Amino acid sequence: GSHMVGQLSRGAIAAIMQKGDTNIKPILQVINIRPITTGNSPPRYRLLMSDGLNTLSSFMLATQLNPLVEEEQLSSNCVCQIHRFIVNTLKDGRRVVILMELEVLKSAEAVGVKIGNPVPYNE
Ligand SMILES: Cc1cccc(NC(=O)c2sc(=S)n3c2[nH]c(=O)c2sccc23)c1C
Numbered sequence: 001g002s003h004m005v006g007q008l009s010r011g012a013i014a015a016i017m018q019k020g021d022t023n024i025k026p027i028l029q030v031i032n033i034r035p036i037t038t039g040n041s042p043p044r045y046r047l048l049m050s051d052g053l054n055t056l057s058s059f060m061l062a063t064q065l066n067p068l069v070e071e072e073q074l075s076s077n078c079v080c081q082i083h084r085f086i087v088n089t090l091k092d093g094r095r096v097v098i099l100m101e102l103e104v105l106k107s108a109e110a111v112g113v114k115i116g117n118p119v120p121y122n123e
Pocket residue numbers: 037038044
């Protein structure tokens with residue numbers, strides 16, 4: 001209940017990005033989900049996620065998790081626990097976090113709002 005930001009793994013985004021910590025199972029909130037253009041391939045979803053302290057816009061859902069989005073279990077405001085993820089670095093140096101396994105801990109309807117006031121993580 002109270003102190004809502006205590007529901008989220010504050011500091012997890014920086015740990016994933018600064019340290020590359022991959023054994024953690026962080027609890028994050030979905031801020032927004034959007035499709036990205038893929039031409040002739042199954043849809044891909046990019047997620048803006050929050051750990052309570054920071055937001056990060058470069059999470060990518062593994063396509064095997066697409067049905068969570070299409071059947072609306074995974075939507076803006078929901079709180080989820082990431083169980084398996086990998087970090088990948090692009091040619092230009094940017095990094096993306098691919099979500100492989102996750103569990104929705106609380107529905108968008110049960111949470112209802114963006115938790116706290118996280119700020120964009122830079123790099
Ligand atoms: C839309 C879009 C736009 C630009 C690039 C890419 N793709 C990737 O950067 C890479 S690199 C790499 S190893 N994989 C992917 N993508 C994959 O899906 C799978 S599955 C098993 C491996 C990989 C995409 C998907």
